[PDB]
Every structure is written in structure tokens, then in C-alpha cells.
Amino acid sequence: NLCPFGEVFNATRFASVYAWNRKRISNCVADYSVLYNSASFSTFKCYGVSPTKLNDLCFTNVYADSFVIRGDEVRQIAPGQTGKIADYNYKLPDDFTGCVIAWNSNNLDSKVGGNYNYLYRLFRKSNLKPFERDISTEIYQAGSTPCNGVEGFNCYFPLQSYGFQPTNGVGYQPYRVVVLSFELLHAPATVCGPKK
């Protein structure tokens, strides 16, 4: 009855950030200290909760969102940030309660010749709202001339692919990210630390 964090953190495949994955966690016991100590993470940043307090708390639901971005973009996975990732792909709310966890995945997600499997949204008419997901792929009209289905200058396919090459600098290497959000509603709190 331990929470299935292994299925999230140790997943063989991770989503593209524009099509980010969400798993709901419920009705289970979670040791967050064990999680914290389970690997050499490069980011483990909590908001409104703390690593030292989580094992004494109960929540109605935990959501685990996961995806790949490049190293220099992990700083955008935080409340109050701007940039292509925060604005167009994955947005946290200002009042976020949870933890942002990341690790370098260059050994899995780069490839000689480039790994092109991971995508992000490069253009959007307006910013995302918090926890919004946009998987659309219609041509983006970047100027005032209508595109009429024809791509070219000022008429763009809206996604770009990372081109993860093993020799990239670390800021441009792939990082796997898990965002844990802790929700407390007027409902039974079924996700608890071992101290309960």
C-alpha cells in the first residue's frame, strides 16, 4: 500500500513537456524522505511544504506531473516564472503547494545524430493558465497576414523539437522532471506519510 512513486520516477518513457503526463496518487502511504534519498537529484525544490514536514502530513490527492525539458529550463518550473516553457507548455500557479524534482537524463534521452522525440510549444496566442495542457498543432499566425494553410515566414508549425545530442552543454542536455502537487480539499485525506 505504498504510493506508486516508482511508476512515475522510474518510467522507461517520459512525455514531451507540451503533452505533459499526469498521474493521480491516492489511497496510499508515501515516505517522502525515502523518495528524497532515492537518487542523486539535481533539483528538489518544495513550495508551501518541506521535505522535513511531508512525512507528518495527509493530503486528499497528490498529482505527479512528468516530462522532459532542457537543463537551463528547469528554473522555469516554479511559481511566478516566464519563458517559453512556463508561458506555453507547463505553468505552475502562484499559490503552488508541492515539490519540483529533476535529474539529468543525458544517458537515456540523447543520441548520436540527435534525439528528436521530445517536443515543446514555441508559439501560442496567449499564455497557459496554471496546469493547462495544450496539445494542438494548428499553424500559428505570427503576423497580420493570414496563413491559409501555407507555412512560411510569419506562418509557423507551433512545436519545436529539442535536438538532444550527447555532447551538448549541460544547459542543453535533457532533464527528466517530476512535479508533485499536494491538494487538501474538504474530503478524506487518503495520501499520508508514514507518521500519518
Partner: nanobody, 118 residues
């Protein structure tokens, strides 16, 4: 940040013939997640002929749909444009390019010449 896009594969063929263009990228750093093949006929506007983003999001201009195929090399930062069933109006200098931020980059090299002549 430096990139060189080496364009090759053009030639002189008869109508109905085929060519494979190659856009081979090298350098310390470049964004190869989107690659576009452009062409400019004499005294005409440059147009995007075909684009590939990621592994499998492709675009073809109406006039080449069904005749051209864009693809990636499996082991190298190279993209190919297979041009089949060539027509005289495909005659142009073909250029490949990549994105820099939210726009096609300012790279505009020597390209490769395609001539289709009856």
C-alpha cells in the same frame, strides 16, 4: 553557437526524374529539431518547400505534395529531400535552414541548384 549547413544533391535532370538533396549540419551548436527546405526560382519569392519537426511532423507545399519526401539520417545531423516525378517548375536553387528562436535563421548560403529541362 556556430553552425554550417552543407547543401548538396542538386543536379540537371529531365522531367519525371529524381534527385535527393542533403542538408548536412555540423558545428559546436545548432537547433536541428526543425529543418526546412526552401527554394527560390529566378526572380521569384523564396518559399518553404518542405519542413520536418521532431521525427514525424512534416509539411509539404501544395505544389510538391505526393512527389517530395523529407527524412532524417539515422546516425547523423543530416536531413534529406527526396524529389521524385520532377517538373520544369521545380527548377530553382534550394536552400536548407533551421529555426533560431521564433523565426527561421538568417543563414542563407550557396544552396544547391536543381534544373529540370525537357
Amino acid at each position: 553557437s556556430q553552425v554550417q549547413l552543407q547543401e548538396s544533391g542538386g543536379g540537371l535532370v529531365q522531367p519525371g526524374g529524381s534527385l535527393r538533396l542533403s542538408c548536412a549540419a555540423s558545428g559546436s551548436f545548432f537547433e536541428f529539431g526543425t529543418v526546412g527546405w526552401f527554394r527560390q526560382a529566378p526572380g521569384k519569392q523564396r518559399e518553404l518547400v518542405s519542413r520536418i519537426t521532431g521525427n514525424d511532423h512534416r509539411y509539404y507545399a501544395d505544389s510538391v505534395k505526393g512527389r517530395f519526401t523529407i527524412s532524417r539520417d539515422n546516425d547523423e545531423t543530416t536531413v534529406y529531400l527526396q524529389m521524385d516525378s520532377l517538373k520544369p517548375e521545380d527548377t530553382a536553387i534550394y536552400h536548407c535552414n533551421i529555426l533560431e528562436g521564433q523565426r527561421w535563421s538568417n543563414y542563407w548560403g550557396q544552396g544547391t541548384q536543381v534544373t529540370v529541362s525537357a
